[model samples]
Target: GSSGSSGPRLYKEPSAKSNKFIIHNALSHCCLAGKVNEPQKNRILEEIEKSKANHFLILFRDSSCQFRALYTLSGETEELSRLAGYGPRTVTPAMVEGIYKYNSDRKRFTQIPAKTMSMSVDAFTIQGHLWQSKKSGPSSG
Candidate 1:
């Protein structure tokens, strides 16, 4: 696919030093936008707009395994102007890690028994879903 052309692509990854990021923890925005009908998507977006308070990590998962919205945001605004709305303010992965570790030490996020899973520094939220390890073996992978 490389024709030796070098141009700015349609996406960008957040710099480790930068405080803002358009983090995607599920399916791509284009896929989700087309996957759902109009009203449902609108409703979901509305919910997102309402729920964001001081909560920065904007991760939303549907009720079943078939559907999910792993939309996240950081900085002044992170809007699609279509699907999910913007996440407020700058929040670095470093900052997120501090909170995650603090809560993790307190035993708040529980384990997902009989599985090789648990929250690592890369992905987790204070109010995110609680699904993790089979036993208290090791927190890091």
Candidate 2:
């Protein structure tokens, strides 16, 4: 067993200012082609922080009119690259495309079923419950 139990708390709550910067950085580079305006940007930041999930997905259309999905982890980039199927190499925001299919009939950006993607990266499922919560319930029943 490991024995260094006397260490002080290794983690500290990130300052709001620093957290905002990290979230803003992730949104700017990874979502909406970095063109999100202030109001919208702040709104997204609130949503992410409210959800309390480090990772979230955004579906949007690029300037080319191509639908794309961005899976971002606040304050992170490398893990996203690995999730996107890039192995052992640095990834750019340009390389963070998600698997999606356009529905011409309804004009929708639909995600490709996770089963169709590489099994190793199949954990890309969106956490739909993040937006579905309406009540603040206790953690235990």
Candidate 3:
């Protein structure tokens, strides 16, 4: 099956029936895998559990001291859609600095020099540029 689409497939959105599980799984990766404290983790979990929305707007800011970066697995979330597994990761300077490319000569992951970053009000330009940087990190945003 094909849409004759030129690019990647669309992401899976969260369903009302599965929203609870969806939110739980996301929190697990963010709070659990990240080793966040139980009190704080439970607090976030409880807050999400109480809310009722077809889709959740989740964001993990890049802070300096604690939790430099974390996100909802799939970089993007939409109404009635739930992304899979630990929500890959959203874009960040850490990701940029951490990204590497395999070099046959060195037989190891080598750093990719110089990234393309631009501040633009145009969504399309940003999207186009970001798509070009998929090597840096997996994203559905």
Candidate 4:
């Protein structure tokens, strides 16, 4: 004879439910409104050195010394799309208006005209670029 103490297991929420689509419709474009420090600059330089890619797009704001470096397999792209939930439609020439390129020999970034640069969809995959905020340090005489 079997014991009567055992009970049946209870079922909870479904584990295999499909995920819901999310819409990220936020227009908050923030930046590090300060100066690019030594470590920050060195980090970007080191990355360029490690990467075999020749062409890179650098975007920096005078207001914020922070900079973004984007690498492309081929130097053929002007229109770049910012990481967003919308879609690739976000790609626009206006985004690269004042974009720059890293000069390995000079160890500095130089601006390139958007009109002269080409365009590509491959750049969207690079994770080197992002928004950062750096506050100004105390000034000394």
- lDDT by residue (tens digit), candidate 3, 12-42: 6633332345435444544233544556556
Q: How close is candidate 4 to the true structure, as a TM-score?
A: 0.32
Model 4 C-alpha lDDT per residue in residues 17-89, reported as the tens digit of each score: 2111000000011121224434544444455455544433333333223434323323233444332122223
Count of backbone clashes for each model?
2, 0, 10, 6
Segments of candidate 3 deviating more than 4 angstroms: 1-20, 31-35, 62-141
Candidate 4: residue 9 Cα off by (Å): 67
Best by lDDT: 2
**Can you rank all candidates by lDDT, best first?**
2, 3, 4, 1
State each model's CA lDDT, in order: 0.30, 0.38, 0.33, 0.32
> Could you tell me which residue pairs clash in candidate 2?
none
- Across 38-128, the per-residue lDDT of candidate 1 in tens digits comes to 5655555455455442222333232222223323343334321112433323333322222211123452222232221112221233222
Per-residue lDDT for 84 in model 3? 24
- Rate residue 44 of model 4 by lDDT: 44
- Candidate 1 residues lying further than 4 Å off, grouped into runs, are 1-28, 35-37, 54-67, 70-141
Structural similarity to truth (TM-score) of each candidate = 0.25, 0.29, 0.30, 0.32
Model 4: residues >4 Å from true position, as ranges? 1-36, 62-66, 69-73, 76-94, 99-114, 118-141
lDDT of 3: 0.33
Q: Name every residue pair that clashes in candidate 1.
A: 75-89, 112-132
What is the lDDT for 45 in model 1?
48
Pairwise lDDT winner, candidates 3 and 4:
3
Clashing pairs in 4: 32-132, 32-133, 34-64, 34-65, 77-118, 78-118
